[PDB]
Amino acid sequence: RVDFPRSRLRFKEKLGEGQFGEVHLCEVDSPQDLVSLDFPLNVRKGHPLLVAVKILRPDATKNARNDFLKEVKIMSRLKDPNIIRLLGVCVQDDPLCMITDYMENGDLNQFLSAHQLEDAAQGPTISYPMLLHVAAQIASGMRYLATLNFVHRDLATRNCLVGENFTIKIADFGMSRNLYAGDYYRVQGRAVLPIRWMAWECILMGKFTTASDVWAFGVTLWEVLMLCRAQPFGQLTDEQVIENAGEFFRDQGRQVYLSRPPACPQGLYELMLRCWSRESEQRPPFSQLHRFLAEDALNTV
Ligand SMILES: Cc1ccc(C(=O)Nc2ccc(CN3CCN(C)CC3)c(C(F)(F)F)c2)cc1C#Cc1cnc2cccnn12
Ligand SMILES: Cc1ccc(C(=O)Nc2ccc(CN3CCN(C)CC3)c(C(F)(F)F)c2)cc1C#Cc1cnc2cccnn12
Question: What positions constitute the catalytic site?
């Protein structure tokens, strides 16, 4: 438990900005000097060590600082191939920083927007099996979060990151990266919520659980199979999305569901529909979602 040396973080560019600070892409100066029990980092000789750095504005309120430190504690526990990894912190003096691995292909929404489905769309291709592999990795990371008794609360392709060889890491940007403002609705005062990804019980009663994470996974998987080309419920206004949550509650058959993506087979679609069951206990666990995507869907190509 010692700070990473801030003087070794060499700025390259801004990855995001928000009310309370920024995210920077940095290079670690001569990273081999640091390798030890205290910092057992992975350096590849001949390859720069790139890292992402979340930084709190030095004039932040005391409550903002407590938020940042709480996030540090959470991140310090996360150790999984499909979750973003904490490499070090700077917290003994200001500005507070947290340092993670850098995912070189950006967020999953950006990534998939730039791809087309393997045979006018443009750019590099991505196959249907590769899309199942992207989704399986998200289910695997979420399964791990759930076993540690964490609820994500904002699962969407915008909070997933892409590294080498189609590797996905779940992340959560909170207010550090004010992209995608069009995905959040202002329900009260200064509070904005990702209503198009939220289970009806989240919207009506502010109840967030692994089962509402499963509901958001359904929507995220719909995004993946659509190659991020369309907003969920894009035919409906925000106020109509809220009304739709009310119809899940009323349960009289007026509720509407996201349509089957063209690249989605009927069984996978029926699994997505189960993610949107009215009753929490009827939604599939992430173990079952992962298995379906890694086995069933693959064996029936
Ligand atoms: C510097 C940095 C700091 C922090 C985080 C961050 O993701 N923190 C986080 C906090 C909590 C949770 C879990 N909880 C969620 C809430 N929940 C209520 C409790 C459970 C998780 C999660 F991944 F587990 F979800 C992540 C990401 C970055 C980044 C970066 C980066 C790296 N490559 C790139 C390339 C382009 C852009 N950015 N970027
Ligand atoms: C129509 C409608 C529109 C908007 C909102 C709304 O603003 N919901 C809201 C959800 C969550 C949060 C955030 N949370 C985080 C964690 N926390 C532990 C709970 C707070 C907030 C926030 F404002 F606090 F951000 C608001 C609610 C309704 C409703 C309803 C309702 C309730 N029972 C019934 C029965 C029949 C019909 N409707 N209905």
Answer: 154
Question: Could you confirm whether 154 is annotated as catalytic?
Answer: yes
Q: Which of 256, 159, 152 is nearest to 200 (CA)?
A: 256
256 φ/ψ sector (left φ>0, alpha ψ -120 to 50, else beta): beta
* Fold classified for 103-296: Transferase(Phosphotransferase); domain 1 (1.10.510)
Ligand 1 binding pocket includes 64 (Cβ within 6 Å) = no
- Which of the following is catalytic: 101, 154, 183, 213? 154
Kindly give, in sequence order, each residue whose CB lies less than 8 Å from that of residue 61, ignoring residues fewer than 6 positions away: none
Q: How was this structure determined?
A: X-ray
Half-sphere exposure of 1 (CA within 13 A, CB side): 5
Which of 56, 83, 84, 157 gets mutated to test ligand 1 (max ligand atoms within 8 A of its CB)? Answer: 84
